[PDB]
Structures are given as structure tokens and as C-alpha cells.
Amino acid sequence: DIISVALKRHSTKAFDASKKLTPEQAEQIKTLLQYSPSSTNSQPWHFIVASTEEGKARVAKSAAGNYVFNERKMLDASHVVVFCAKTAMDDVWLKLVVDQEDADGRFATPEAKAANDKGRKFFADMHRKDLHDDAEWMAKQVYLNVGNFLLGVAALGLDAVPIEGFDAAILDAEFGLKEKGYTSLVVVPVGHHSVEDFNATLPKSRLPQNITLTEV
């Protein structure tokens, strides 16, 4: 199932504006973003899904300067996801993680809740106090979600492309992510490709396993 899905999914370079997402797939697109794994269930992310031609326009302002080639993907596609990560990891936000676990039924007795809180506060203190790469630590959790997402919509029969070529500073101001405490990382449109997408036609290229893989 998944092997040939991974072998034909491709970064679409041109979208068909009229092919809109099913009312329900517009809710499973929501579902794949939430139920993705994260270091100690940190989930240090926030998502802005733009489905309107008012919302899709505000994001595409980001694709300025040397990013002009990525703007039609922002507009022509039906549903545009903007991946964001926390700037810094506060104590109350990790309190929110465990309490949500508590309500969802992961702990029998109270002892386990405290333990996880500090199993989390071990790794958190490891990165936010000793290594001082918490921003980057949290960012890598979201690129994992990106990867989870790009295979998800592909198997769901939807076209998509991941994009980093955008001016984060404006997208941060446009939706005030600096004020909330977040930073844009990757913009993934999803929709349906036009035959104006020259990548649907071209064969996939990877480097051979003898270069990339080691068996022991």
C-alpha cells in the first residue's frame, strides 16, 4: 500500500483552483496534523489552515523577493497549512500537556502523572537550560509532522508540495506569531494538481542505497 504511494507522490508545481477538498477530507487534513508524534508528547506546534481566498492571499504575501515562484501554489491550492513551532517552552504549556493526558485516561493512579511530568521535565531541562537549543529542538518535532503530513495527504489522494522558500518575517507579522509566541517554518498547500504541474510527469530521482544506507 504505502510503498507505491511513496513512489508516486510528488511535489506539485501548479494547482487547479477549482478542485476543492471534500468536506470530510478537510477534517481529516485537520486530523493528521494533531495525531502526529512528538518528543515526550511535547506537541510544540501551532497550525494556521487557510481555506478561503482571503486567508490564502494573506499567506502568499510571504512569497515575495526571491520567493516569487512559490506564490501561485499559495493561491491556486484549496487548503494551505502553515506549520509553526513555539519560540520557547514555558512551564505552564508542559503542564497543559500532562493535564490533557490526565483527562484522556492515560494514568490509573496519581503517581504516574507526576512521573511523566518529570520524564518530560528531564528532556525539557536538557534542551532549554543546558544545550539551549529548545527553539531548534521544538522545530524538529514539526518537520517530523511535515513528513507525517506529506505521506498522509498523498495516500488520501490529494496533491501537495512542501515549501521553505518564503520570508518568515512577514508571515510572522501577518498573523502575529511573534505576539502569540510562535514562528512559521514550512508552508504546505494541498489540493489537486493542474497538468500545468510538470513534476507529475517526470520520474523520481534518489541517490542509490549503496551511498545512503549501511547494513550491519
Ligand X SMILES: CC1=CC(C)=[N+]2C1=C(c1cc[n+](Cc3ccc([N+](=O)[O-])cc3)cc1)c1c(C)cc(C)n1[B-]2(F)F
Task: Give the residue closest to ligand X by C-beta.
Answer: 198
Q: Is 13 marked active-site?
A: yes
Of the candidates 189, 187, 184, the residue with the CA atom closest to the CA atom of residue 84: 184
The catalytic residue among 27, 53, 136, 164 is 164
Stretch that binds ligand X, among 77-85, 104-112, 132-140, 150-158 (CB under 6 A): 104-112
Of the candidates 178, 174, 200, 164, the residue with the CA atom closest to the CA atom of residue 57: 174
Residues 73-102 interacting with its own copies (rule: CB under 8 A): 96-97, 100-101
Of the candidates 123, 147, 149, 150, the residue with the CA atom closest to the CA atom of residue 137: 123
| C-alpha span between 214 and 111 (Å, rounded) | 43
Residues 60-89 interacting with ligand FMN (rule: CB under 6 A): 70
Nearer to ligand FMN among residue 40 and residue 51 (C-beta) = 40
| C-alpha span between 73 and 190 (Å, rounded) | 9
Can you tell me which residue has the cell 547494513? 215
Nearer to ligand FMN among residue 53 and residue 164 (C-beta) = 164
Rounded to the nearest whole angstrom, what is the least distance from the CB of residue 143 to ligand FMN in the complex? 7
* Site size toward its own copies, by CB under 8 A: 76
Residues designated catalytic:
13, 73, 164
